[PDB]
Amino acid sequence: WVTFYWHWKHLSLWQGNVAQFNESSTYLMGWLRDYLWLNSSPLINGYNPYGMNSLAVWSWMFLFAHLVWATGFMFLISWRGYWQELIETLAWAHERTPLANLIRWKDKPVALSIVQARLVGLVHFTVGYILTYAAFVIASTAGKFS
Amino acid sequence: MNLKKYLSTAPVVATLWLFLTAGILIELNRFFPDSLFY
Amino acid sequence: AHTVKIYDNCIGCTQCVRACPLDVLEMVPWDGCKAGQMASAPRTEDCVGCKRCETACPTDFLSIRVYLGGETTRSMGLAY
Amino acid sequence: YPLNPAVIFIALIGWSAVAAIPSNIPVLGGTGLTQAFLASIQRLLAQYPTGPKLDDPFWFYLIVYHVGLFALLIFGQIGYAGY
Amino acid sequence: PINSSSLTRAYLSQLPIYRRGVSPFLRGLEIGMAHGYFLIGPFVQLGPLRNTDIKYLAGLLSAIGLIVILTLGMLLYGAVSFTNDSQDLESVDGWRQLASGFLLGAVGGAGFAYLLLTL
Amino acid sequence: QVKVVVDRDVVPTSFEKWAKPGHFSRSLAKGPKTTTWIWNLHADAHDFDSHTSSLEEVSRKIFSAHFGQLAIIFIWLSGMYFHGARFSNYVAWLSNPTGIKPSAQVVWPIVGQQILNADVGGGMQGIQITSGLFQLWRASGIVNELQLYVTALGGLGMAGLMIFAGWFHYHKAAPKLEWFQNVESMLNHHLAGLLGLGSLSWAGHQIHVSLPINKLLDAGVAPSSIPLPHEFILNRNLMAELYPSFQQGLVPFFTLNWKQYSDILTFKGGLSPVTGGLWLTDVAHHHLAIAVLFLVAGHMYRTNWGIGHSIKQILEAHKGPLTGEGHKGLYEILTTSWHANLAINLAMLGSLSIIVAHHMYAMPPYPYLATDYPTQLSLFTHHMWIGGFCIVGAGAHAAIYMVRDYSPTVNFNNVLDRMIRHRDAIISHLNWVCIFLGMHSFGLYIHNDTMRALGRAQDMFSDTAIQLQPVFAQWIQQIHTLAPGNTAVNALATASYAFGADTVTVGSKIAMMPIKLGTADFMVHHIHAFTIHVTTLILLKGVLYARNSRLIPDKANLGFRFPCDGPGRGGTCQVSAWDHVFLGLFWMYNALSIVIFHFSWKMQSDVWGTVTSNGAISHITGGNFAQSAITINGWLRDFLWAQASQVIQSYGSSLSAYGLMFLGAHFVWAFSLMFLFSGRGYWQELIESIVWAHNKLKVAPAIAPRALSITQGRAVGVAHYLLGGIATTWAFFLARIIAVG
Amino acid sequence: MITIPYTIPTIMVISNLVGVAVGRYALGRSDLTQLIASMCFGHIIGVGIVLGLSNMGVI
Amino acid sequence: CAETEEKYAMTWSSDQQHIFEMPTGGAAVMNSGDNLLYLARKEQALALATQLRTQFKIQDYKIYRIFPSGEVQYLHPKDGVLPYQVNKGREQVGRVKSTIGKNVNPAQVKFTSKATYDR
Ligand code: CLA
Ligand code: CLA
Ligand code: CLA
Ligand code: CLA
Ligand SMILES: CC1=C(/C=C/C(C)=C/C=C/C(C)=C/C=C/C=C(C)/C=C/C=C(C)/C=C/C2=C(C)CCCC2(C)C)C(C)(C)CCC1
Ligand SMILES: CC1=C(C/C=C(\C)CCC[C@H](C)CCC[C@H](C)CCCC(C)C)C(=O)c2ccccc2C1=O
Ligand SMILES: CC1=C(C/C=C(\C)CCC[C@H](C)CCC[C@H](C)CCCC(C)C)C(=O)c2ccccc2C1=O
Ligand code: SF4
Ligand code: SF4
């Protein structure tokens, strides 16, 4: 909220229309309309079925970062004992099959412990969050300018 | 006899009361709409 | 191994042993309570550490405490 | 478990001859159900890369032939349940 | 139980591992003789250089590019696992002969498919 | 044998046990020493198979509760007919359906919200219907408001018969278990009596009400010169002019001269290009086919006369060699446990509801249904989501049967537990299919995403790039083009216009266009195969590992809604058969979110839209699918960003409530996450640190304020994830297409 | 429906007679429900024959 | 597997051919006289002990812990006695002098290889 607020304050100063902020920031569709829906337009046009431009990195990264962020939810929402009894199906299927029961593990396959799992879901939440917003700051201001 | 004891439970009193205060606000906002003063 | 330690709140009501699905805990005759019983945990090498004991431990606060220690083959409880 | 894998070919006469002589004209096959396929495989058999999705008498009489042929050979293995 | 019958047992028995006795260099040379002939396929028709006359050469450099990585995985797995010296594929020496057989037989499979894409 | 044995005057009808909340469970009538008694009051309120093991008392409770459900459904339908009567513009809508947007609910005039009253024509405003009731009523033949008032009145009357019915069947005439396990008679009366006489009598309604009325409305007569439906039965002379086959009476029926009923009943298919719906001749003929075919279908179960089957002698005869015992046991499984029957009936009910959704977009069965696209949209969408959730209930109640009512004595070597003998080989190949389809259904989107982002659009999976034209769907779709002359011999038009000939334009609005499936639609079908296999992975993992996993070898002892076992085995959080249902609800939201996002964007690019003169074509998005569904930037830009423009700009206008149900449903969505990520070991002594601030001021609550339990504290996270996430797409869909359609 | 020379009732009673011939085989007790069940089945077979003989072919 | 991991061999006797439920899953035949059962891990085995004992009399039962060197152990029973029943032979280990209330703070255990309860 600090950096959405700062960044949407200065996309009103740098554009010039301060009234675009002050009339359309006192409510939430002012934010999701006048800031996220409008300033992601030169982002999400980073590459089209007509071509691409220099923002095609960030518009890629943007999407990439959503895929980071929601993978975090797989570790944050859904906890271990699902996977600890699913790795047993994978290790049953690997042990029982031919042509791969030769290639046996040394470290026994075990689902991630529930401090690590909350931690790795937190790490994908951070990396997805921060890469999404570093995509949107730079692609947004670099799309309205430069 | 025990019907009033059902009408004394938590959700039934909470709906007969929040229905009443909601009626205070809705009937007090038809009669006095756009009340930003006072 | 998960070090299970059984403190002196253990009034010997045996919901720990009847609750543990691993027989790591037994009952020991100990003349310090009214029932004369106090649980013991000799075979903590088999201890999973699922803390199903500490669910059914009706003391004031948890005569039997399961400290999560090392992780061997059996204590990890993997099937293969 | 497969105790009696005796014969397969008895299904073939069991499925071609029950569909050859019934013509049932106004469908894809003005002739019988199998003549409209066996007549329509020899035009394509000698290394022809044709036969697109609009090729009705080949592609349709692939599935509508094999879906009864599979069922009648499976019921041919049910023809070794009474043994 | 089921899918362990004598047709399954006879077919898995004469595979290029479960068969009785081969030198592990040739035992791996049969493995790479299959796989290296195989891996030219999904790089010629679908690779990045599938439109120049390097439809076929990019299959070699890409496929052998996989092959040296796969032998690197072979040598890692025989480095970490298979600590004993029972002289077969469960050893170190037999496994590195299996890996060298996979490398020479696999590059031989790649060049064989490359020269058989001439026709 | 078959007889009716009913206890009379079973339970007294006093209000006494209402004064004892939690009277029902002996584990719960202790009184609340904590607030978790409150919530467990509600989660145990319908554990009818967990009050008492006596199946008679359980079965009386449920069978009386069904009439409570039908009481709420008749209150609901009587609500729809009365809101159609008093509040709606239905009589005005019946004049010109393509101009007047349908609306019933007329918002009360308080502060601002009178702006929600959309001026939808008809001389009266109000918020617009997207449920499509008016299209059901024009098909029904309801002419003026009086039949809506009368049918709402009969809806209340049937609601009173269901309240008095369930009251009568729990308290003062309640049946024995011998009445309930009479399942040959239950099928014998539902296959014949419910469904059979329902479709037959409905064919009577359609022939003697809807066919003359929706012939007169197909001619374009205003609903004043139309006589009563009533007035068609007093004399055939008002129907012999419309259909001359009514002049012959029933004499060509009983002489089997059914060629003569070609006027009333026919086999055409297609769509009537005047009304944009099905031909009601085809629909009435159709319900006669369900009528004779279901009434024949009812009589395969021997009840009293030694004529018919029993389920036992059917199931025991399928003693196939790869299963060994065969189905020996399932008639004792499915006539003792109710959760098993609930698993089957919820699975087939939900999948029937999805079948309902598909058969309502592609064969629009109501007149002027495909001309107002929101009713065309949301009736697809809504029957998907109950079409979805009812599948997960299968995965719930097949799990519960495996936990609660499973019994290895009756269930020994049969078809059931021989699955559980190789459930590793079940779940492992679901695991392989999920990863194979995930790579080959989503890695294609990352691939085309990068190839469009790397500039090399030749290396994509587009039309022009590496094509992935769905061969089988185009082929069998072409078989359906070649249906009505070749194989459906007595047909005239195709089964749908989602298959074959040129499109249907009704009032410059496209009813149904032949859907082309090329190389993007392929990959979305592999999405759907993928996210169907993942929910099948979680909901078969939740049934096969419901009872004795190799991780935790006693889940039957722990229960169904247990949270976990503990930190042992490295942690076994979220391991119960309930928890797989918890995950199947998220994947339900995924799988159906992309079913409807596949729908509402391929059918805004390839079907819907308007037409101009000389047969020209104009979709809503304008053909912008196959060049844009192949990536995700094309997906998120061209659909979730571009289609938001009529939701997000909706303030000040009549769609603005959706603009409130768009933001707030984001809220609830994100408000779910607080319950999902955190846990009650935080909230319990956060709360208890607040209980310090109440103990300081003597505002200590007597019911001790615990945090939520774990299974509750995650169940509420699902139940906000779905209300928030579903209501986002709800307000986004209806705010999108009302601004166009 | 005309008399004894060949028409629709000529080819219903033969289907009803072979239907009650099936009722002699399918739990062949001589009770009422042999007739009410099995004449009904041969009645189904009869109606399935009559119009099927009427659609594709001369009656 | 049986080449490197401990297989637990539950042995027991009964009186009638009943039907119990495996911890693998699915029903088992339950030989009436005397029967063994090789299992994977101990919780499965004692979960079968609760599976049988909470149903009916199944006593004189115990797992021999097959460890892959070959010999056996005696789990469960240990002393012809049921574990929550008190025998005067079990010597207690795993206790301290008091409750948690006298455990030392871990800033006293810090930089030492002790535990927070040892006193
Ligand atoms: C999983 C989905 C998927 C698929 C099918 C492809 C497919 C492709 N990508 Mg790719 N890609 C993907 C995901 C995917 N990608 C993702 C997720 C990313 C981003 C992380 C990328 C990033 C990417 C780049 C950057 C590039 C490609 C390129 C390509 C093309 C050539 C790659 C190649 O040589 O294949 C390798 C194939 C193999 C090594 C063969 C293994 C697969 C075989 C066929 C399995 C067979 C098993 C067999 C059936 C077993 C049964 C038989 C047995 C019983 C005997 C090819 C069309 C390149 C290109 O130019 O496109 C034209 C390119 O430059 N991709
Ligand atoms: C042919 C007769 C007949 C008919 C029409 C029905 C119809 C129905 N049964 Mg039912 N049933 C029957 C015979 C019949 N049953 C027999 C013989 C048995 C014993 C084996 C059962 C046992 C049974 C159970 C155990 C349950 C049902 C349920 C249902 C309802 C399903 C919900 C539904 O489809 O909503 C559509 C709703 C309607 C179409 C409304 C129909 C209501 C009208 C008035 C017809 C009802 C006829 C009624 C039986 C007459 C009572 C006779 C009495 C006065 C002597 C539906 C009302 C379920 C339910 O929801 O409970 C109510 C349920 O759980 N039935
Ligand atoms: C966007 C977030 C996200 C993603 C990608 C996944 C992905 C997956 N989940 Mg999932 N999940 C999520 C959120 C997510 N989940 C959430 C929020 C929940 C909460 C309810 C769940 C709950 C859940 C359950 C309960 C289960 C899964 C399962 C799976 C797997 C299904 C198999 C598959 O698709 O393989 C294909 C893999 C992908 C499509 C991921 C993209 C990979 C690309 C295509 C290729 C690789 C990229 C690149 C080449 C990597 C190499 C380069 C790199 C090393 C530098 C898959 C990995 C199932 C499972 O574990 O086994 C099947 C399962 O049972 N999930
Ligand atoms: C001849 C009588 C008849 C007529 C006029 C209709 C007419 C209709 N049905 Mg249909 N239907 C029928 C019989 C009939 N049905 C039977 C007997 C069944 C059960 C098998 C169905 C099952 C059915 C479904 C599931 C659906 C329809 C739908 C429709 C409507 C779509 C328009 C269309 O082209 O459908 C033309 C109809 C057909 C092509 C169906 C032909 C069914 C044949 C007669 C089945 C014969 C069964 C017989 C035992 C032989 C089995 C083997 C056979 C498969 C080779 C239309 C009103 C759809 C709908 O609801 O519209 C929105 C829809 O979803 N019908
Ligand atoms: C689909 C199918 C299948 C599969 C397939 C396959 C099996 C294939 C493969 C194939 C392959 C995979 C092949 C391979 C090839 C190779 C060969 C036959 C050989 C050759 C030789 C070589 C390669 C050589 C090399 C070299 C060189 C060149 C130089 C020097 C070195 C060396 C000597 C190494 C089957 C039949 C099962 C069944 C039916 C269907
Ligand atoms: C998906 C998922 C998994 C599956 C994750 C698997 C087990 C890990 C797969 C990623 C590893 C890194 C793949 C192995 C390949 C590596 C290259 C091998 C070397 C890695 C180490 C040397 C670091 C869990 O174990 C889990 C545990 C607890 C809660 C939620 C979840 C969970 O959501
Ligand atoms: C916030 C949160 C809580 C706290 C939720 C609190 C305890 C419940 C707050 C809602 C209740 C209903 C408020 C009580 C208000 C009463 C209804 C009385 C108020 C008067 C009127 C509204 C009737 C958990 O208990 C929890 C448990 C497990 C995982 C996550 C969480 C979690 O995220
Ligand atoms: S400690 Fe709690 S559980 Fe263990 S014995 Fe004493 S009372 Fe029973
Ligand atoms: S630790 Fe886990 S296993 Fe050992 S006793 Fe306490 S609960 Fe039973």
* Chain A residues within an 8 Å CB radius of C51: none
Q: Is the Cβ–Cβ distance between C77 and F568 less than 8 Å? A: yes
Chain A touches chain B, with at least 3 Cβ pairs below 8 Å, answer no
Min CA distance, H18 vs chain C (Å)? 23
Which token pair is F528? 């759907």
Close Cβ partners of D67 (under 8 Å, ≥ 6 residues apart) = none
F491, two tokens: 């047909």
Phi, psi for residue F573 in degrees, rounded to 5: -65, 140
Nearest CB to F489 within list D1, D27, D56: D27
Of all atoms in ligand 2, which is nearest to the CA of residue F63? Answer: 64
Question: Hey, what are G50's tokens?
Answer: 């009559």
Contact in structure between H8 and H66 (CB atoms under 8 Å):
yes
Contact (CB, 8 A) for A85 and F550: yes
Q: Which one-letter DSSP state was computed for residue F442? A: H
Per-residue HEC secondary structure of F598-660 comes to: HHHHHCCCCCCCEECHHHCEECCCCCCCCCCCCCCHHHHHHHHHHHHHHHHCCCCCCCHHHHH
CA distance F580 to F587: 10
Take residue D52 and report the two structure tokens written for it: 């697109």
b/e per residue, F93-131, with b = 16+ CB within 10 A? bbeebeebbbbbebbeeeeeeeebbbebbbeebbbbbbe
- Please give the Cα distance from F674 to F714 (Å, whole number): 10
Query: Tokens in use for A91?
Result: 């290790």
Distance of alpha carbon H22 from alpha carbon F553, whole angstroms? 9
Cβ burial, residue G13 (10 Å; 0-12/13-18/19+):
exposed
D27 Cα to chain F: minimum distance (Å): 4
Assign residue H50 the CATH number of its domain.
3.30.1470.10
**Distance from Cα G14 to the centre of ligand 9, integer Å:** 79
The closest of A61, A74, A70 to A133, measured between CA atoms, is A61
User: Residue F354 C-alpha to ligand 2 middle, in angstroms?
Assistant: 25
Nearest Cα to Cα of residue A90 among F579, F440, E4, C78? C78
Task: Determine how many CB atoms are found less than 10 A away from the CB of residue F423.
Answer: 24
Q: What angle do CA F571, F575, F577 make, to 5 degrees?
A: 170
Tell me the residue length of chain F.
Answer: 741
How far apart are alpha carbons F484 and F491 in whole angstroms? 5
Round to whole Å and give the CA distance between F654 and D32. Answer: 63
Largest CA distance in chain A: 70
Q: Which residue has the tokens 């939201």?
A: F589
Q: Which residues contact H82 (CB under 8 A, 6 or more apart)?
A: none
Helix (H, G, I), strand (E, B) or coil at F457: helix
Separation CA A35–CA A15 (nearest Å): 12
Question: In what helix (H) or strand (E) does residue D31 lie, and over which residues does it extend?
Answer: none
Q: After which residue numbers is chain A interrupted with C–N beyond 2.5 angstroms?
A: none
Three-state SS for H103?
coil
Amino acid at F723: L
Pull the structure tokens for residue F256: 């089997």
What does DSSP assign to residue H35?
Answer: E
Residues 6+ apart with CB under 8 A from F263: F243, F244, F245, F281
Rg (alpha carbons) of chain D, rounded to whole number: 15
Q: Tokens 């894998």 correspond to what residue?
A: D5
Q: Cβ contacts of residue F271 below 8 Å, gap of 6+? A: F277, F278, F279, F363, F364, F370, F493, F497, F504, F511, F512
Length, in residues, of chain H: 119
| Residue G33 with chain F: CB contacts under 8 Å | 305-307
Would you call E42 an interface residue with chain F, using a CB distance cutoff of 8 Å? no
Cα(H11)–Cα(H22) distance, integer angstroms: 14
Which DSSP string do the residues of F651-688 spell out, in sequence order?
TTSTTHHHHHHHHHHHHHHHHHHHHHHS-HHHHHHHHH
DSSP F511: E
Cα distance between residue A70 and residue F173, in whole Å: 55
Report the distance separating Cα A88 and Cα F427, nearest Å: 10
> Which residues of F sit within 8 Å Cβ distance of B?
14-16, 18-19, 21, 110-111
- Find chains touching chain B: ≥3 CB pairs under 8 Å: F
List the structure tokens of F297.
């279908």
Report the pocket of ligand 5 as residue ranges, CB < 6 Å.
Answer: E 33-34, 37-38, 104-105, 108-109, 111-112
- Asked if residue E98 lies in contact with residue E35, where contact means CB atoms within 8 angstroms, the answer is no
* F181 Cα distance to chain centroid: 28
Q: What is the number of the ligand 2 atom nearest to the C-alpha of F69?
A: 60
**Does the CB of A76 have a partner CB in chain F at under 8 Å?**
yes
CB under 8 Å to E100, separation ≥6 — which residues? E25, E28, E71
Residue H25 falls in which region: left (phi positive, over 0), alpha (psi -120 to 50) or beta: left
| Domains of chain F by start residue, with CATH | 1-741 (1.20.1130.10)
Left, alpha or beta for F249 (phi > 0: left; psi -120 to 50: alpha)?
left
In the block, residue with structure tokens 């911890």: H23
Secondary structure of chain A as H, E, C letters: CHHHHHHHHHHHHCCCCHHHHHHCCCCHHHHHHHHHHHHCHHHHCCEECCEECCCHHHHHHHHHHHHHHHHHHHHHCCCHHHHHCCHHHHHHHHHHCCCCCCCCCCCCCCCCCCCHHHHHHHHHHHHHHHHHHHHHHHHHHHHHCC
Give the max Cα distance, chain B.
47
Residue that the structure tokens 């989107």 belong to: F445
CA pair distance C71, A110, nearest whole angstrom: 12
Q: Is G8 on the interface with F (CB under 8 A)?
A: yes
Write the single-letter amino acid at C26.
Answer: E
Question: What ranges in chain C are assigned the alpha helix state H?
Answer: 15-19, 52-55, 73-76
Rounded Cα distance between F563 and F266, Å, is: 58
Token readout for A93 is 């299927």
Min Cα–Cα distance to chain F from H56, Å: 14
- C-alpha D60/C-alpha D58 separation (Å) is 6
Q: Is C50 annotated as a binding residue?
A: yes
Please state the length of chain A. Answer: 146
- Give start and end residues of each alpha helix (H) in F454-520: 471-481
Is the minimum distance from the CB of F195 to ligand 3 under 6 angstroms? Answer: no
Provide the residue range defining the domain that includes H84.
Answer: 1-119
Min Cα–Cα distance to chain A from E81, Å: 7
Q: How many domains does chain H have?
A: 1
Nearest to F506 by CA among F655, F643, F359, F376: F376
Beta bridge partners of H9: H38, H64
Residues 6+ apart with CB under 8 A from G48: none
Q: Residue F574: its chain A contacts at CB < 8 A?
A: 78-82
Q: Which residues of F are annotated as a binding site?
A: 564, 573, 666, 674, 682-683
Q: Distance of CA H35 to CAs B26, F575, H17, H31, H108, Å?
A: 76, 32, 11, 6, 54
Which method resolved this structure? Answer: cryo-EM
Contact: C80, A108; criterion CB under 8 Å: yes
- Ligand closest to B21 (CA) is 7
Are F209 and F316 in contact, with CB atoms under 8 Å apart? no
Burial of H51 (0-12, 13-18, 19+ CB in 10 A): buried
B 7-36 near F (Cβ less than 8 A): 9, 26, 29-30, 33-34
Crossing angle of the two packed helices F36-43 and F710-738, in degrees rounded to 10: 60
Domain ranges of chain C: 1-80
For chain E, how many residues are written?
119
DSSP assignment letter at F494: -
F489 by DSSP, 3-state: which? coil
Best CA proximity match to C21, nearest among C58, C49, C61: C49
Residue with the nearest Cα to atom 19 of ligand 7? B14
C76–F570: do the CB atoms touch at under 8 Å? yes
Token code pair at residue G42: 């041969």
Question: Using an 8 Å Cβ cutoff, are F534 and F584 in contact?
Answer: no
Q: Which residues of C8-35 are buried (b: 16+ CB within 10 A; e: fewer)?
A: bbbbbbbbbbbbbbbbbbbbbebeeeee
- Nearest CA to A109 among F149, F279, C78? C78
Inter-chain Cβ pairs, chain A and chain E, closer than 8 A = 11
Beta strands F510-512 and C37-40 are unpaired
d(CA F299, CA F188): 6
SS (H, E, C) G1-59: CCCCCCCCCHHHHHHHHHHHHHHHHCCCCCCHHHHHHHHHHHHHHHHHHHHHHHHCCCC
CA H50/CA H48 separation, integer angstroms = 5
- The CA distance from H38 to H22, in Å, is 11
Residue H114: CB atoms within 10 Å: 12
Asked if D52 has any chain F CB less than 8 Å from its own CB, the reply is no
- Pairwise CA distance, residues F203 & F206, whole Å: 5
Contacts E48 to F, Cβ<8 Å: 456, 459
Question: Minimal Cα–Cα distance from C68 to chain A, Å?
Answer: 13
Give all chains having 3 or more CB-to-CB distances under 8 Å with chain E: A, F
Distance B11 CA to ligand 7 centre (A): 15
The reply to whether residue E48 touches residue F459, judged by beta carbons under 8 angstroms, is yes
> Which of F305, F7, F318 has its CA nearest to residue F169?
F7
CB H6 within 8 A of CB H68: yes
- Subunit contact F322:E48, Cβ cutoff 8 A: no
> Strand, coil or helix: what is B9?
coil
Bridge partners of A52, per DSSP, are: A47
Contacts of F3 (CB under 8 A, 6+ apart): F178
- Please give the distance, rounded to the nearest whole angstrom, from the Cα atom of residue F438 to the centre of ligand 1: 13
- Using CA positions, which residue lies closest to atom 13 of ligand 6? A109
Is residue F295 a contact partner of residue F189, using CB atoms and an 8 Å limit?
A: no
Q: In Å, how far from its chain's centre is CA D52?
A: 20
Is C20 annotated in some ligand binding site? yes
d(CA H119, CA H115) in angstroms, rounded, equals 9
Which of F286, F296, F363 best tests ligand 4's pocket when mutated (most atoms within 8 Å of CB)? F286
| Structure tokens, F688 | 């208890």
Please calculate the CA angle F333-F334-F340 and round it to the nearest 5 degrees: 95
Is the Cβ–Cβ distance between F575 and A82 less than 8 Å? yes
- Whether the CB of G27 is below 8 Å from some CB of chain F: the reply is yes
Q: Which of D53, D54, D77 to mutate to test the interface with F (most CBs of F within 10 A)?
A: D53
F267 lines ligand 4 (CB under 6 A): yes
| Interface contact flag, B6 F18, Cβ < 8 Å | yes
Q: Which protein residue's CA is at the shortest distance from atom 21 of ligand 7?
A: B14
B/e letters for A34-60, b = 16+ CB within 10 Å, e = fewer, are bbbbbbbebbbbbbbbeebeebbbbbb
Resolution (A): 3.6
Looking at chain A, which residue has its C-alpha nearest residue E81? A106
What CA–CA distance (Å, rounded) separates F640 from F686?
A: 39
Rounded distance, CA F415 to CA F329, Å? 9
- Please give the CATH topology (third level) of the domain spanning C1-80: Alpha-Beta Plaits (3.30.70)
- Could you report how far apart the first and last alpha carbons of chain D are, in Å? 13
The residues lining ligand 2, judged by C-beta closer than 6 Å to any ligand atom, are F 63, 66-67, 70, 182, 185-186, 189, 193-194
Rounded CA gap, F582 and F600, in Å? Answer: 27
CA F584 to centroid of chain Cα atoms: 16
Chains with 3+ CB–CB pairs under 8 A to G are: F
- HSE-CB at F542 with a 13 A cutoff on CA atoms is 30
Q: Are E105 and E32 in contact (CB under 8 A)?
A: yes
Name the β-bridge partners of E42.
none
* Residue A82 marked in a binding site: yes
Q: Per the structure block, which two tokens stand in for E114? A: 């490359």
Locate F16 and state its tokens: 């006494």
F274 lines ligand 4 (CB under 6 A): no
Q: Does the beta carbon of C17 lie inside 6 Å of ligand 8?
A: no
Q: Is C76 near chain A, with CB under 8 Å?
A: yes
**Residue in A with minimal Cα distance to F577:** A82
- What CA–CA distance (Å, rounded) separates F553 from E72? 41
Report in angstroms the alpha-carbon separations of F85 from C44, F129, F142, F694: 74, 14, 11, 53
